[PDB]
Design a protein around this nucleic acid. Structure first.
Lengths: 49, 96, 49, 262, 144, 31, 48, 98
DNA sequence: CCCCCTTGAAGACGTGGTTTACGACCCCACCGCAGTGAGTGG
C-alpha cells in the first residue's frame, strides 16, 4: 500500500498550474500569448479563436 | 423575519451555544491564555505581571526590528529595563 | 535465547558488568555538540565507565 | 445564457439578471414541457429560477462547506423538480421545487461534513438535524435527558449517546503517539522468532523418544495441516479400538511433557 | 463591561420592521462548584449569565402602531468563567493566567519614511488613521 | 441536619464522563 | 493489588509494576500447529 | 498517491488524524462526479461552465494551493498543505528527511 | 498394565432456514533582493 498508485479520469481537461503560474510561463512562451489572456480564457472569462 | 406565530417567547429568540463557544475558545485557546508557572511564588507573581507585545493584533517575532526592542526613555518607572527573556523574544516581553 | 539474555541484562547481574567492560574496550564513540560549525565539533574518544 | 462566469460572484449576477416570469406564461412553458417534451421550455424554466436556489443555499452556511458547492447541489435538485412538474395542478413551481432543492443539499452535508460519514442509518439521520436545536448547554446529556430526546424521535438511548459523541469530535491534522507505526519494532519480532524456534526443536527431540506407533498418533492428529486424523481413522489403520487411540495420546503426551520439562 | 456589548448589539430590529428585541438588565448566578471542588473534579469554575429580554410586537394595521403586545422573559446566555482571589482562572481543573497585551493605540499617527528613494535622496511623509474596529485610511506622498 | 445533607448530596454526586467511558482511575506517585 | 484490582495506598513501586488491573476482549487468533501442540501438552487453557 | 503516504488513523474519543491530501482528493472527485452527472443530465451551458471552473480550481488547489488566489483553508483557518508543500522548504522532504 | 468394548452424553461445526439489521435507493404540488513589464518619449 506504500507503492501502489491510482488514477482519476477527468471529465474535462485541466491545466497544470506549475506550467502556467511559475514564471516564466511555459505555456505562454510556447504560444507567444500573454499570461493574462491565457488566465482569462482558462477560468471562463473570454473566448479565443 | 421568517417566523409566523405571535405567541413567541424570548427563549425562542436566544440560542446560547455560540456565546459560550466563543468564551470557551478565548479562555482555552488564546495565545495569551497559558498554564500558570508554579515553580515558586515569585514565578507566579512574575507571570501575573507580565506584559507581552505578541498575540492577536500584535507584532510578530520574525517581523520585528531593533527599534521596538530597545529601551526607551519613557520606560523609566513603567517597564523594567533589565527583566526580559534572553532569546528571540528579547524585546517583545516585558515586566511591570 | 535472546529472551534469557534480555532478562539477565534487565536484572543487571554482576557478569553483565564484566561483559560490558570487555565490549567497550577499544570501541570508540563519537561526541557531538550543537551547533556544529566546523569539523572539530565531532571527535572520537575511548570510553571510560 | 452566454454571460461570462470567472468566479462565483460573477455567476450570481447572471442568475439575478434573469427576469422572474409570472404565473400566466409559466403555465405555457410547463404545458409544452409536460406533453410535447419541449427542451426549450425546460431551459427557460430552469434559468428563470436560478436565483431561487442561490438564496436557499445561504441558509446552510453554518456547516462550513463552500458556498459554490452547495449552490450546484441545489441546481441538480431544481432540474429534477422541473422534469416532474404537472402544470394542471395550478401551484407555482417555486413551492413544488423547495422540497427537491433542500433534499439535495441535506444529502451533501451528511457525506461531507467530516472526513468520515457521521450518519448512515435511519435513526442517525434523524438525530443529526435535531440534536443541533435540542442541545442548549455545552457538555454531555445526563441520563434523564436521554430518554426525553429518545422518546420524541422514536430512537433508542444507545443512538442518542452515540451521535452525541460524533457531534463534538474534532479531527486533528497529521504532522503524540499517533505518528508511530505499531508494527515497526523489528527487535521484538527477532526475539519472538528466536524463542519460538528453540521451543519447536524441543518438541522434535521429545517426539523422537516416543515409540513408533505413538509418534504417528501425535503427528497425524496434531502436526498435520492438510488433514486432522480423528480417533476412528487411526483405529482401523492399526486395528485398535476408538478409545485405545484416545487413551494412547494421554500417556504419550505425558512422555512428551516429561522430556520437554527436563 | 457586558453593559457596553449589550447596548452595542441591542436593540435588534427585524428586516420588515414588525418586531424587535429590547435588552433590560442582567445578573450572574451562584457557581455550582467551589474552586477546590472544581480542581478535584477537573471542571471549569464559572457562573451562569441570565439576561432579561423584552419582545415588542409592531402592529402593521396601523402606520404608527407598535403596541400590539409586549413579552418579558429571563433568558440564559451561558457560562462566564470566574476569577479566583489570586487572579487566576480554573479551566478544566487547571489554573491559567491571562497575560496583558501592549499594542498601538487607536487614532492618527504621522510618519516619515526613510531609506526609500535614497537615489532621489528625499523623504516621504505618510499618515494613517487606525480605528478600534473598522478599516484603515492612509495618505502618502510619492517623490513628485 | 439540612446543611449536613446538602454536603452529603454534593459529596456523593456522580461524575460527567464522555460517552463510551465506564470509569477512570488516577494514581499519584511521589519521589 | 486489592480486591478491586487497585494498588494499595502507601505501596512502594518500580518500573513494570501493576497499578490498575484491566482486561480486554481479544477475539479470534491464529497460531502455528507446533505452538498449539506445545500449549496443549503443557495443559494451559485458552482465554478470551 | 498511495494511501500509506497520506495516513488516516482513528483515535480514542471518536477522533481521526488525517492528511489534507485526502480532503483535496475528495473535493476533486466530488466536483468531477458532479460534472459528469450534469453532462449526462443535458444541463444548460452556464452551469456546466461553472462546474468546469470549479473543477479547475480544485485541481489547482490540489497541485499547489497558495499560488493563484485565496488558499483553501481548513478547520483552524489555516491553509491546507498541498503536494508541492511536501517537497519544498525547510520542512520539506529534502532538508528534513534526506 | 497391554488390549478390544461400551452407553451416556458433551460439545463440535456448521447452516442456510429464519430473521433482524445495515446501507442505499426511491417520492415529497519585515527584508533586501532581482527579474518583469509596460511605457513612456524619442
Amino acid at each position: 500500500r506504500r507503492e501502489r498508485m491510482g488514477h482519476i479520469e477527468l471529465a474535462s481537461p485541466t491545466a497544470h498550474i506549475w506550467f502556467l503560474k511559475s514564471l516564466p510561463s511555459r505555456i505562454g512562451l510556447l504560444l507567444d500569448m500573454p499570461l493574462r489572456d491565457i488566465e482569462r480564457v482558462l477560468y471562463f472569462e473570454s473566448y479565443v479563436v | 423575519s421568517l417566523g409566523d406565530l405571535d405567541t413567541l417567547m424570548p427563549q425562542d429568540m436566544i440560542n446560547a451555544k455560540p456565546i459560550s463557544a466563543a468564551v470557551k475558545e478565548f479562555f482555552g485557546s488564546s495565545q495569551l491564555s497559558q498554564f500558570m508557572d508554579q515553580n515558586n511564588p515569585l514565578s507566579e507573581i512574575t507571570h501575573k505581571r507580565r506584559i507581552s507585545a505578541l498575540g492577536p493584533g500584535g507584532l510578530t517575532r520574525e517581523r520585528a526590528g531593533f527599534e521596538v526592542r530597545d529601551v526607551h526613555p519613557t520606560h523609566y518607572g513603567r517597564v523594567c529595563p533589565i527583566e526580559t527573556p534572553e532569546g528571540p523574544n528579547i524585546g517583545l516581553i516585558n515586566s511591570l | 535465547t535472546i529472551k534469557a539474555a534480555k532478562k539477565m541484562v534487565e536484572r543487571e547481574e554482576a557478569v553483565v558488568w564484566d561483559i560490558l567492560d570487555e565490549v567497550i574496550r577499544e570501541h570508540p564513540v563519537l561526541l557531538n555538540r550543537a551547533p556544529t560549525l566546523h569539523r572539530l565539533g565531532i571527535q572520537a574518544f575511548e570510553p571510560v565507565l | 445564457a452566454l454571460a461570462p462566469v470567472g468566479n462565483l460572484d460573477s455567476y450570481i449576477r447572471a442568475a439575478n439578471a434573469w427576469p422572474m416570469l409570472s404565473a400566466d406564461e409559466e403555465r405555457a412553458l410547463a404545458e409544452k414541457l409536460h406533453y410535447h417534451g419541449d427542451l426549450e421550455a425546460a431551459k427557460t424554466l430552469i434559468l428563470s429560477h436560478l436565483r431561487f436556489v442561490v438564496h436557499i443555499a445561504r441558509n446552510y452556511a453554518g456547516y462550513g462547506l463552500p458556498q459554490a458547492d452547495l449552490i450546484q447541489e441545489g441546481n441538480i435538485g431544481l432540474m429534477k423538480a422541473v422534469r416532474r412538474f404537472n402544470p394542471e395542478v395550478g401551484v407555482r413551481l417555486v413551492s413544488f421545487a423547495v422540497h427537491w432543492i433542500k433534499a439535495e443539499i441535506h444529502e451533501y452535508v451528511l457525506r461531507n461534513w467530516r472526513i468520515v460519514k457521521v450518519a448512515t442509518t435511519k435513526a442517525q439521520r434523524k438525530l443529526f438535524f435535531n440534536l443541533r436545536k435540542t442541545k442548549q448547554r455545552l457538555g454531555w446529556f445526563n441520563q434523564d435527558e436521554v430518554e426525553m430526546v429518545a422518546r420524541e424521535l422514536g430512537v433508542t438511548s444507545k443512538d442518542v449517546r452515540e451521535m452525541e459523541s460524533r457531534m463534538a469530535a474534532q479531527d486533528m491534522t497529521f504532522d503524540v503517539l499517533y505518528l508511530q507505526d505499531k508494527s515497526s519494532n523489528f527487535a521484538d519480532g527477532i526475539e519472538d522468532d528466536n524463542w519460538e524456534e528453540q521451543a519447536a526443536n524441543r518438541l522434535t527431540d521429545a517426539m523422537q523418544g516416543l515409540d513408533e506407533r505413538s509418534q504417528d498418533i501425535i503427528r497425524a492428529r496434531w502436526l498435520d495441516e492438510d488433514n486432522k486424523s480423528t480417533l476412528q481413522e487411526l483405529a482401523d489403520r492399526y486395528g485398535v479400538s476408538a478409545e485405545r487411540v484416545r487413551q494412547l495420546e494421554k500417556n504419550a503426551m505425558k512422555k512428551l511433557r516429561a522430556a520437554i520439562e527436563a | 463591561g457586558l453593559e457596553a456589548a449589550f447596548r452595542s448589539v441591542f436593540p435588534i430590529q427585524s428586516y420588515s420592521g414588525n418586531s424587535e428585541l429590547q435588552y433590560v438588565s442582567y445578573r450572574l448566578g451562584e457557581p455550582v462548584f467551589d474552586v477546590q471542588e472544581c480542581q478535584i473534579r477537573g471542571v471549569t469554575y464559572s457562573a451562569p449569565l441570565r439576561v432579561k429580554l423584552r419582545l415588542v410586537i409592531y402592529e402593521r394595521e396601523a402606520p404608527e402602531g407598535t403596541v400590539k403586545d409586549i413579552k418579558e422573559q429571563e433568558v440564559y446566555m451561558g457560562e462566564i468563567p470566574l476569577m479566583t482571589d489570586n487572579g487566576t482562572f480554573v479551566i478544566n481543573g487547571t489554573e491559567r493566567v491571562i497575560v496583558s497585551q501592549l499594542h498601538r493605540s487607536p487614532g492618527v499617527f504621522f510618519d516619515s519614511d526613510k531609506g526609500k528613494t535614497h537615489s532621489s535622496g528625499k523623504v516621504l511623509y505618510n499618515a494613517r488613521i487606525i480605528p478600534y474596529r473598522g478599516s484603515w485610511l492612509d495618505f502618502e506622498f510619492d517623490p513628485k | 441536619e439540612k446543611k449536613l445533607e446538602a454536603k452529603r448530596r454534593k459529596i456523593t454526586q456522580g461524575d460527567d464522563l464522555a460517552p463510551g467511558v465506564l470509569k477512570i482511575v488516577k494514581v499519584y506517585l511521589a519521589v | 493489588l486489592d480486591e478491586s484490582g487497585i494498588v494499595y495506598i502507601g505501596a512502594e513501586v518500580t518500573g513494570g509494576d501493576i497499578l490498575v488491573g484491566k482486561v480486554t476482549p481479544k477475539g479470534e487468533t491464529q497460531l502455528t500447529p507446533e505452538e498449539k501442540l506445545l500449549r496443549a501438552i503443557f495443559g494451559e487453557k485458552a482465554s478470551d | 498517491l498511495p494511501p500509506d503516504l497520506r495516513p488516516l488513523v482513528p483515535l480514542d474519543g471518536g477522533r481521526f488524524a488525517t492528511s489534507d491530501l485526502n480532503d483535496l482528493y475528495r473535493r476533486v472527485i466530488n466536483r468531477n462526479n458532479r460534472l459528469k452527472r450534469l453532462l449526462d443530465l443535458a444541463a444548460p451551458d452556464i452551469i456546466v461552465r461553472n462546474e468546469k471552473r470549479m473543477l479547475q480550481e480544485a485541481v489547482d488547489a490540489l497541485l499547489d494551493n497558495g499560488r493563484r488566489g485565496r488558499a483553501i483553508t481548513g478547520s483552524n483557518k489555516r491553509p491546507l498543505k498541498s503536494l508541492a508543500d511536501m517537497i519544498k522548504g525547510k520542512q520539506g522532504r529534502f532538508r528534513q528527511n534526506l
